[PDB]
Amino acid sequence: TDPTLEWFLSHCHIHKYPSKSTLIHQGEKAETLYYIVKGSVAVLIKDEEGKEMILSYLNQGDFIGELGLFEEGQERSAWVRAKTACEVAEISYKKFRQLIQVNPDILMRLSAQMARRLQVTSEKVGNLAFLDVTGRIAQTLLNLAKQPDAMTHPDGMQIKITRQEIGQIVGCSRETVGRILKMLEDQNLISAHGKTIVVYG
Amino acid sequence: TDPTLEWFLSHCHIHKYPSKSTLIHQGEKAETLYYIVKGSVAVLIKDEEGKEMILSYLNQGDFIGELGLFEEGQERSAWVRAKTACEVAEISYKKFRQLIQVNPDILMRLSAQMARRLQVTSEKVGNLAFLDVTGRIAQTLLNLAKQPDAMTHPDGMQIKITRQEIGQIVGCSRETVGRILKMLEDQNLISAHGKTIVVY
Ligand SMILES: Nc1ncnc2c1ncn2[C@@H]1O[C@@H]2COP(=O)(O)O[C@H]2[C@H]1O
Ligand SMILES: Nc1ncnc2c1ncn2[C@@H]1O[C@@H]2COP(=O)(O)O[C@H]2[C@H]1O
């Protein structure tokens, strides 16, 4: 059982958010911490022209908006959009800091999540620096194929994903994803038809 | 410095490291936490080929090797090499977790640094994804103009970085860096005198 989590949750005010709604806006003054009770969200950044890139998918049990907790006057570092319908707990940093005194184990949990996120984001940095847009998309297709939800196909592995989700992962437009996917098909690397993509061998 | 910091340091061993020496090797079993008492280090990762990429620079007052602390059986996520001569304090994770029980404020200081690192690293992800090699270099020069080792100037400030270094942060060749540094000079954005660049 987890008494610490119930204790924490009891000090928050829980709300429901339909999918696609924005929970956090980049630039806002940060004064509250969030905790995903149910559902999943996408943490994303945009460029001066609206092109989006997902930094991470966050799910049940994950804290959100923790980056502004340690210093005053911080701004939210990214937008957070509900991927599915969510049930999110919210609490002011001020109240949260009071809880940390009563039981530091709650901070230990938050920090464990921050360390994992740093490891994963550093990994992305490596890829963005070493691969160009074509390689980024190819490697993404390979990783998707290696995932558990990836189905087995007569000629390799089959994955389901829209050209737009791929664009969000690599940080390019869906039209760009379209051109590269077309090129990859001509090189006999994949087979794209509808929302289904077959990765060969 | 303050009493809490000094309290933490009294439970550590302080070791000296010369320039270019490796403090942490990627893949090692993470069992120790470090604190930079004096000096500077670089955090590096690389691709299947051996090409190095500078993830970050850390300085006096920064903790290092904190990532493997929250879960046992983890490997160091990167290589950490001394940029200058360093004076680094170290303590076992086991002993550190004990200190947390006495005074959690020590964990707060650590977590604050991790939060900052996540912000900076995420920003780096944005730069690499949305900026062309030229855009990256212009930004990097500014990020470097913010370093503690940067010198002032009657026209902006100055850095003593090399073309290999810049290429390692941005993700490009020494040649390309030169090519781009040249352009930025024509456009009156910077001025290079040897290994010294004056960022306006
Ligand atoms: N690299 C990342 N990985 C995971 N989550 C992140 C990352 N960058 C930002 N976020 C989350 O997005 C939130 C935006 O608001 P905050 O900056 O307060 O806190 C941020 C973290 O919760
Ligand atoms: N993105 C990053 N920014 C700053 N320091 C980092 C980053 N990634 C790794 N490190 C540091 O490099 C260390 C490598 O060993 P650890 O993984 O134990 O701890 C890591 C952190 O101390």
Swiss-Prot record, chain B:
Residues 13-15 are annotated as: Activating region 2 (AR2). The keyword Disulfide bond does not apply. Residues 131-200 form the HTH crp-type domain. Changing residue 138 to T: In mutant DHKD; a CAP* phenotype, insensitive to catabolite repression. In strain CA8404; a CAP* phenotype, insensitive to catabolite repression. Changing residue 179 to L: Marginally reduced DNA-binding. GO terms for cellular component: cytosol; protein-DNA complex. NCBIfam families: PRK11753.1 (NF008732). One of its GO terms (biological process) is carbon catabolite repression of transcription. Changing residue 56 to A: Enhanced cAMP-binding, enhanced transcription. It holds the Pfam family cNMP_binding. Induction: Constitutively expressed, levels decrease in stationary phase; more strongly induced in an rnlA deletion mutant, levels remain high even in stationary phase (at protein level). Both positively and negatively autoregulated. Changing residue 44 to M: Prevents SpfP from blocking galactose operon induction by CRP. This is DNA-binding transcriptional dual regulator CRP. Residues 46-52 are annotated as: Activating region 3 (AR3). Keywords: Acetylation, Activator, cAMP, cAMP-binding, DNA-binding, Nucleotide-binding, Repressor, Transcription, Transcription regulation. 3',5'-cyclic AMP 2 binds at residues 129-130, 164-174. Binds 2 cAMP; cAMP 1 is in the anti conformation, while cAMP 2 is in the syn conformation. The gene is crp. Changing residue 150 to D/P: Decreased transcription activation (6-29%), binds DNA.
